[PDB]
Design a binder for this molecule. Structure first.
Ligand SMILES: CN1CCN(c2cc(NC3CC3)nc(N)n2)CC1
Length: 154
């Protein structure tokens, strides 16, 4: 069994939008915007909802770019993260209770202050290639196993 999550990257020709997580799971790391998918909403709907709640931004179209499955040792549910990207946003990003947003140049992505898996799959994201990933974590800092492959359909 798995639980559905979303992650949204606003990726524009020269820059990417990340949020510093201010509380809760992953506090203290820069990440895309996202969260749990609710009963009664599509994955895409959930992605737009979390983007709006965390940054105030709305989007015309979200594109599926990846799926990443996480195992945390000792936790029964796998995390099934559906990753989306967009290049056209509506509005200016603003800070929320959960996220403090900032733009980063593509050669200055703060990988040391991100989830360790990002260093593995972000290159594929930046090359506009679709991917399937799997990461086994012990705790929040240690990757024990992983797989990563490019796909034709996410
Ligand atoms: C609600 N959030 C959305 C984003 N998400 C993650 C996780 C992640 N790896 C960690 C599981 C080990 N890496 C990125 N880039 N995003 C976690 C749950």
């Amino acid at each position: 069994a798995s639980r559905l999550y979303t992650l949204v990257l606003v990726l524009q020709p020269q820059r990417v939008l990340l949020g510093m997580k201010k509380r809760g799971f992953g506090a203290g790391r820069w990440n895309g915007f996202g969260g749990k998918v609710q009963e009664g909403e599509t994955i895409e709907d959930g992605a737009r909802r979390e983007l709006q709640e965390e940054s105030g931004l709305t989007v015309d179209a979200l594109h599926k770019v990846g799926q990443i499955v996480f195992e945390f040792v000792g936790e029964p549910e796998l995390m099934d993260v559906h990753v989306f990207c967009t290049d056209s946003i509506q509005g200016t990003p603003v800070e929320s209770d959960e996220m403090r947003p900032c733009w980063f140049q593509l050669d200055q992505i703060p990988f040391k202050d991100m989830w360790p898996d990002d260093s593995y799959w972000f290159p594929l994201l930046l090359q506009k290639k679709k991917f399937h990933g799997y990461f086994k974590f012990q705790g929040q800092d240690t990757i024990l196993d992983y797989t990563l492959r490019e796909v034709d359909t996410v």
